PDB file of C-alpha atoms and ligand atoms in Angstrom:
ATOM      1  CA  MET A   1      50.945  64.768 116.125  1.00 48.18           C
ATOM      2  CA  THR A   2      54.308  65.079 117.935  1.00 47.30           C
ATOM      3  CA  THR A   3      56.284  68.251 117.617  1.00 46.94           C
ATOM      4  CA  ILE A   4      59.652  67.173 116.189  1.00 48.15           C
ATOM      5  CA  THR A   5      60.254  64.078 113.967  1.00 49.74           C
ATOM      6  CA  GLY A   6      63.708  62.580 114.403  1.00 47.21           C
ATOM      7  CA  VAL A   7      65.528  61.628 111.201  1.00 50.87           C
ATOM      8  CA  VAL A   8      68.632  59.504 110.759  1.00 53.13           C
ATOM      9  CA  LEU A   9      70.433  60.461 107.559  1.00 51.89           C
ATOM     10  CA  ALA A  10      71.980  57.254 106.317  1.00 53.58           C
ATOM     11  CA  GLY A  11      73.128  58.620 102.969  1.00 55.85           C
ATOM     12  CA  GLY A  12      71.924  58.538  99.399  1.00 53.92           C
ATOM     13  CA  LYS A  13      73.491  57.747  95.983  1.00 51.44           C
ATOM     14  CA  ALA A  14      75.656  54.600  95.586  1.00 50.32           C
ATOM     15  CA  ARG A  15      77.550  56.525  92.899  1.00 48.28           C
ATOM     16  CA  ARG A  16      79.712  53.481  92.296  1.00 48.55           C
ATOM     17  CA  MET A  17      77.677  50.323  93.256  1.00 50.00           C
ATOM     18  CA  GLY A  18      77.511  51.756  96.738  1.00 50.16           C
ATOM     19  CA  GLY A  19      80.680  50.318  98.185  1.00 47.81           C
ATOM     20  CA  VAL A  20      80.601  50.480 102.034  1.00 44.73           C
ATOM     21  CA  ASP A  21      77.194  51.114 103.583  1.00 42.19           C
ATOM     22  CA  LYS A  22      78.484  53.321 106.466  1.00 44.67           C
ATOM     23  CA  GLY A  23      75.193  53.241 108.456  1.00 44.33           C
ATOM     24  CA  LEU A  24      75.330  49.497 108.668  1.00 43.59           C
ATOM     25  CA  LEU A  25      78.906  49.296 110.054  1.00 43.64           C
ATOM     26  CA  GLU A  26      78.666  47.845 113.547  1.00 45.63           C
ATOM     27  CA  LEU A  27      79.859  49.498 116.757  1.00 45.39           C
ATOM     28  CA  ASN A  28      79.726  47.010 119.618  1.00 46.52           C
ATOM     29  CA  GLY A  29      77.425  44.709 117.671  1.00 48.03           C
ATOM     30  CA  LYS A  30      74.963  47.469 116.723  1.00 50.36           C
ATOM     31  CA  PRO A  31      74.853  49.297 113.387  1.00 49.54           C
ATOM     32  CA  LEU A  32      75.961  52.925 113.647  1.00 48.43           C
ATOM     33  CA  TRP A  33      72.660  54.210 112.267  1.00 48.03           C
ATOM     34  CA  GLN A  34      70.851  52.353 115.057  1.00 47.10           C
ATOM     35  CA  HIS A  35      73.049  53.994 117.676  1.00 47.59           C
ATOM     36  CA  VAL A  36      71.852  57.307 116.276  1.00 48.62           C
ATOM     37  CA  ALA A  37      68.239  56.157 116.030  1.00 49.01           C
ATOM     38  CA  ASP A  38      68.258  54.886 119.620  1.00 47.90           C
ATOM     39  CA  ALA A  39      69.703  58.195 120.828  1.00 44.89           C
ATOM     40  CA  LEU A  40      66.978  60.111 118.986  1.00 47.05           C
ATOM     41  CA  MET A  41      64.284  57.779 120.389  1.00 46.86           C
ATOM     42  CA  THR A  42      65.452  58.661 123.927  1.00 46.14           C
ATOM     43  CA  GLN A  43      64.326  62.187 123.225  1.00 44.04           C
ATOM     44  CA  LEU A  44      61.652  61.923 120.499  1.00 46.00           C
ATOM     45  CA  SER A  45      58.700  59.532 119.961  1.00 46.74           C
ATOM     46  CA  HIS A  46      58.739  59.446 116.183  1.00 44.09           C
ATOM     47  CA  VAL A  47      62.009  58.614 114.421  1.00 41.08           C
ATOM     48  CA  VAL A  48      62.542  57.576 110.787  1.00 39.27           C
ATOM     49  CA  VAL A  49      65.604  56.847 108.672  1.00 38.39           C
ATOM     50  CA  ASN A  50      66.554  58.042 105.188  1.00 39.92           C
ATOM     51  CA  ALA A  51      68.431  55.245 103.361  1.00 39.46           C
ATOM     52  CA  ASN A  52      68.663  54.455  99.661  1.00 38.74           C
ATOM     53  CA  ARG A  53      70.526  51.114  99.818  1.00 42.64           C
ATOM     54  CA  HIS A  54      69.936  47.879 101.687  1.00 42.32           C
ATOM     55  CA  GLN A  55      66.499  49.158 102.628  1.00 42.82           C
ATOM     56  CA  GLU A  56      65.354  45.717 103.850  1.00 44.10           C
ATOM     57  CA  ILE A  57      68.247  45.690 106.331  1.00 44.60           C
ATOM     58  CA  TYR A  58      67.313  49.213 107.558  1.00 40.65           C
ATOM     59  CA  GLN A  59      63.670  48.100 107.786  1.00 41.22           C
ATOM     60  CA  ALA A  60      64.661  45.306 110.249  1.00 41.69           C
ATOM     61  CA  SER A  61      64.391  47.363 113.421  1.00 42.71           C
ATOM     62  CA  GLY A  62      60.832  48.469 112.772  1.00 39.76           C
ATOM     63  CA  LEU A  63      61.352  52.112 111.777  1.00 37.25           C
ATOM     64  CA  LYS A  64      60.038  53.733 108.598  1.00 37.20           C
ATOM     65  CA  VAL A  65      62.647  53.796 105.867  1.00 36.32           C
ATOM     66  CA  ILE A  66      62.427  56.817 103.502  1.00 34.50           C
ATOM     67  CA  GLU A  67      64.123  56.694 100.085  1.00 36.76           C
ATOM     68  CA  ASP A  68      65.244  59.722  97.979  1.00 37.60           C
ATOM     69  CA  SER A  69      63.226  61.034  95.077  1.00 38.32           C
ATOM     70  CA  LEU A  70      64.365  60.009  91.565  1.00 35.70           C
ATOM     71  CA  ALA A  71      65.549  63.617  91.096  1.00 36.55           C
ATOM     72  CA  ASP A  72      68.828  62.321  92.485  1.00 32.96           C
ATOM     73  CA  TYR A  73      69.814  65.664  94.008  1.00 31.78           C
ATOM     74  CA  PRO A  74      73.302  65.846  95.504  1.00 31.05           C
ATOM     75  CA  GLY A  75      74.422  65.747  99.075  1.00 30.80           C
ATOM     76  CA  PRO A  76      72.740  65.637 102.466  1.00 33.98           C
ATOM     77  CA  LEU A  77      70.162  68.298 101.600  1.00 33.92           C
ATOM     78  CA  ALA A  78      68.569  65.861  99.118  1.00 33.75           C
ATOM     79  CA  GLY A  79      67.764  63.460 101.935  1.00 30.93           C
ATOM     80  CA  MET A  80      66.399  66.256 104.080  1.00 30.31           C
ATOM     81  CA  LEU A  81      64.074  67.305 101.314  1.00 30.57           C
ATOM     82  CA  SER A  82      62.973  63.711 100.548  1.00 29.02           C
ATOM     83  CA  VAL A  83      62.026  63.252 104.171  1.00 31.28           C
ATOM     84  CA  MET A  84      60.082  66.556 104.391  1.00 29.81           C
ATOM     85  CA  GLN A  85      58.215  65.556 101.201  1.00 32.52           C
ATOM     86  CA  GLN A  86      57.269  62.157 102.723  1.00 30.94           C
ATOM     87  CA  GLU A  87      56.593  63.108 106.360  1.00 33.15           C
ATOM     88  CA  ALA A  88      53.996  65.439 107.822  1.00 33.66           C
ATOM     89  CA  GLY A  89      54.612  67.649 110.744  1.00 34.31           C
ATOM     90  CA  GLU A  90      56.161  70.884 111.434  1.00 33.26           C
ATOM     91  CA  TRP A  91      59.713  70.205 112.706  1.00 31.70           C
ATOM     92  CA  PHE A  92      62.513  67.735 111.916  1.00 29.64           C
ATOM     93  CA  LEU A  93      65.703  66.970 113.839  1.00 29.42           C
ATOM     94  CA  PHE A  94      68.177  65.548 111.323  1.00 30.98           C
ATOM     95  CA  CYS A  95      71.340  63.712 112.355  1.00 31.67           C
ATOM     96  CA  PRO A  96      73.786  61.726 110.243  1.00 29.70           C
ATOM     97  CA  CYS A  97      74.158  58.003 110.785  1.00 30.18           C
ATOM     98  CA  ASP A  98      77.824  58.310 111.889  1.00 29.43           C
ATOM     99  CA  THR A  99      77.585  60.300 115.163  1.00 32.25           C
ATOM    100  CA  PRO A 100      76.611  57.584 117.632  1.00 32.57           C
ATOM    101  CA  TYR A 101      77.162  59.523 120.862  1.00 31.59           C
ATOM    102  CA  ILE A 102      74.656  62.364 120.296  1.00 35.05           C
ATOM    103  CA  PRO A 103      73.267  63.497 123.645  1.00 35.88           C
ATOM    104  CA  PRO A 104      69.785  63.245 125.172  1.00 34.93           C
ATOM    105  CA  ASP A 105      69.372  66.987 125.265  1.00 38.78           C
ATOM    106  CA  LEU A 106      70.060  67.536 121.538  1.00 39.93           C
ATOM    107  CA  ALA A 107      66.476  68.343 120.629  1.00 42.32           C
ATOM    108  CA  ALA A 108      65.797  70.266 123.862  1.00 44.32           C
ATOM    109  CA  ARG A 109      68.881  72.517 123.571  1.00 43.22           C
ATOM    110  CA  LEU A 110      68.405  73.171 119.866  1.00 44.16           C
ATOM    111  CA  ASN A 111      64.753  74.070 120.573  1.00 41.76           C
ATOM    112  CA  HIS A 112      65.697  76.282 123.610  1.00 44.57           C
ATOM    113  CA  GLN A 113      68.231  78.159 121.486  1.00 42.22           C
ATOM    114  CA  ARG A 114      66.209  78.520 118.299  1.00 44.09           C
ATOM    115  CA  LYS A 115      65.175  82.079 119.226  1.00 41.78           C
ATOM    116  CA  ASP A 116      62.635  82.347 116.393  1.00 42.35           C
ATOM    117  CA  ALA A 117      64.970  81.022 113.609  1.00 41.21           C
ATOM    118  CA  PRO A 118      63.550  78.400 111.237  1.00 40.12           C
ATOM    119  CA  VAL A 119      66.741  76.327 111.331  1.00 38.20           C
ATOM    120  CA  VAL A 120      69.474  75.736 113.901  1.00 39.81           C
ATOM    121  CA  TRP A 121      72.378  73.322 113.887  1.00 40.78           C
ATOM    122  CA  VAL A 122      75.100  72.086 116.259  1.00 38.64           C
ATOM    123  CA  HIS A 123      78.496  73.691 116.730  1.00 41.78           C
ATOM    124  CA  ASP A 124      80.768  71.507 118.899  1.00 41.04           C
ATOM    125  CA  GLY A 125      83.289  74.213 119.840  1.00 41.48           C
ATOM    126  CA  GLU A 126      85.646  73.265 116.995  1.00 37.84           C
ATOM    127  CA  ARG A 127      83.344  72.937 113.978  1.00 37.39           C
ATOM    128  CA  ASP A 128      79.816  73.275 112.604  1.00 36.21           C
ATOM    129  CA  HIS A 129      77.780  70.119 112.137  1.00 33.65           C
ATOM    130  CA  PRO A 130      75.164  71.561 109.746  1.00 31.73           C
ATOM    131  CA  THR A 131      73.570  68.159 109.137  1.00 29.46           C
ATOM    132  CA  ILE A 132      72.676  67.881 112.865  1.00 30.58           C
ATOM    133  CA  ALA A 133      69.871  70.396 112.400  1.00 30.60           C
ATOM    134  CA  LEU A 134      66.434  71.246 113.772  1.00 30.88           C
ATOM    135  CA  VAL A 135      64.476  72.471 110.754  1.00 28.99           C
ATOM    136  CA  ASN A 136      60.962  73.936 110.405  1.00 31.69           C
ATOM    137  CA  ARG A 137      58.554  72.900 107.614  1.00 31.43           C
ATOM    138  CA  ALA A 138      58.891  76.315 106.104  1.00 30.04           C
ATOM    139  CA  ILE A 139      62.322  75.363 104.805  1.00 28.06           C
ATOM    140  CA  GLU A 140      60.804  72.767 102.426  1.00 28.26           C
ATOM    141  CA  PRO A 141      60.077  75.160  99.512  1.00 26.92           C
ATOM    142  CA  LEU A 142      63.470  76.896  99.941  1.00 25.52           C
ATOM    143  CA  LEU A 143      65.285  73.528  99.866  1.00 23.11           C
ATOM    144  CA  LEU A 144      63.382  72.414  96.802  1.00 23.80           C
ATOM    145  CA  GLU A 145      64.241  75.696  95.030  1.00 23.19           C
ATOM    146  CA  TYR A 146      67.909  75.441  95.979  1.00 23.59           C
ATOM    147  CA  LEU A 147      68.314  71.857  94.861  1.00 24.09           C
ATOM    148  CA  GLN A 148      66.298  72.495  91.611  1.00 22.06           C
ATOM    149  CA  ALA A 149      68.756  75.326  90.881  1.00 16.48           C
ATOM    150  CA  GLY A 150      71.567  72.778  90.874  1.00 13.99           C
ATOM    151  CA  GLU A 151      73.106  73.792  94.263  1.00 15.72           C
ATOM    152  CA  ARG A 152      74.394  71.356  96.884  1.00 20.25           C
ATOM    153  CA  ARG A 153      76.313  73.295  99.585  1.00 20.92           C
ATOM    154  CA  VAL A 154      74.877  72.542 103.015  1.00 20.24           C
ATOM    155  CA  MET A 155      76.332  75.370 105.127  1.00 22.86           C
ATOM    156  CA  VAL A 156      75.546  77.901 102.402  1.00 22.25           C
ATOM    157  CA  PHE A 157      71.930  76.715 102.399  1.00 16.68           C
ATOM    158  CA  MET A 158      71.626  76.853 106.211  1.00 15.89           C
ATOM    159  CA  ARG A 159      72.871  80.427 106.090  1.00 18.72           C
ATOM    160  CA  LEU A 160      70.532  81.417 103.201  1.00 15.87           C
ATOM    161  CA  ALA A 161      67.615  79.925 105.183  1.00 17.81           C
ATOM    162  CA  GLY A 162      68.393  82.256 108.115  1.00 19.22           C
ATOM    163  CA  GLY A 163      69.749  79.632 110.482  1.00 20.33           C
ATOM    164  CA  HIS A 164      72.297  79.830 113.261  1.00 22.47           C
ATOM    165  CA  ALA A 165      74.721  77.658 115.120  1.00 24.08           C
ATOM    166  CA  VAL A 166      73.899  76.483 118.636  1.00 23.27           C
ATOM    167  CA  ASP A 167      76.854  76.029 121.005  1.00 23.44           C
ATOM    168  CA  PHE A 168      77.325  72.465 122.277  1.00 24.34           C
ATOM    169  CA  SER A 169      81.021  72.922 123.055  1.00 24.03           C
ATOM    170  CA  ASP A 170      80.335  71.785 126.652  1.00 20.89           C
ATOM    171  CA  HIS A 171      79.293  68.338 125.508  1.00 21.35           C
ATOM    172  CA  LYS A 172      82.623  66.622 125.448  1.00 18.65           C
ATOM    173  CA  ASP A 173      82.881  64.322 122.461  1.00 17.83           C
ATOM    174  CA  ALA A 174      79.112  63.768 122.015  1.00 18.40           C
ATOM    175  CA  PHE A 175      79.495  64.864 118.367  1.00 16.13           C
ATOM    176  CA  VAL A 176      82.485  62.808 117.298  1.00 19.43           C
ATOM    177  CA  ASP A 177      81.824  61.248 113.920  1.00 17.15           C
ATOM    178  CA  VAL A 178      82.973  57.848 112.696  1.00 15.30           C
ATOM    179  CA  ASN A 179      83.687  58.497 109.000  1.00 13.03           C
ATOM    180  CA  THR A 180      85.642  55.346 108.062  1.00 12.63           C
ATOM    181  CA  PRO A 181      85.828  51.674 109.125  1.00 11.14           C
ATOM    182  CA  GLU A 182      89.374  52.607 110.262  1.00 13.89           C
ATOM    183  CA  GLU A 183      87.872  55.273 112.615  1.00 11.25           C
ATOM    184  CA  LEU A 184      85.208  52.837 113.842  1.00  9.73           C
ATOM    185  CA  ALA A 185      87.850  50.357 115.033  1.00  6.07           C
ATOM    186  CA  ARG A 186      89.170  53.084 117.410  1.00  7.65           C
ATOM    187  CA  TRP A 187      85.790  53.340 119.279  1.00  7.36           C
ATOM    188  CA  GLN A 188      85.211  49.611 119.812  1.00 12.81           C
TER     189      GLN A 188
HETATM  190 LI1  LIG B 201      76.234  45.346  97.902  1.00 16.12          LI
END
């Protein structure tokens, strides 16, 4: 019913008994994934989270938790596909669980700059963030074919799908990512 579903990508696998659950690390008392979810809810009515560990903890804030298919495909594309297979609706705005400062015009600017492409993603002036991506439904069969072929590379896929980068270089620091607990400590 709404146009774009927001999706927080809070990782798959647990390729050694998980280890650190990055989405649940807390920034000012609030799990990183929830910072992302709250920022997406500012701009979108329907937001879900892809998480494959500690699902009960993710389920605590009342959002739908989507788990990866048993295919166990590699990398962030696997979560994107699992969500498209389990959610209706024509557009998805994906964002990883570690970029807590994403801006309230993320969806609007990506949509304004889509210019007929089926996929666009954020470029922050220094690097591509191909997992912060507005993706049309039509990408679902292409993703499934790519992952079934044994591929994993995210940027390569986004290029094959006919996507382009959208320039968010004017958004100072909105796309900083917190990759480690060590990094997290610096933003408290
Ligand atoms: Li554990």
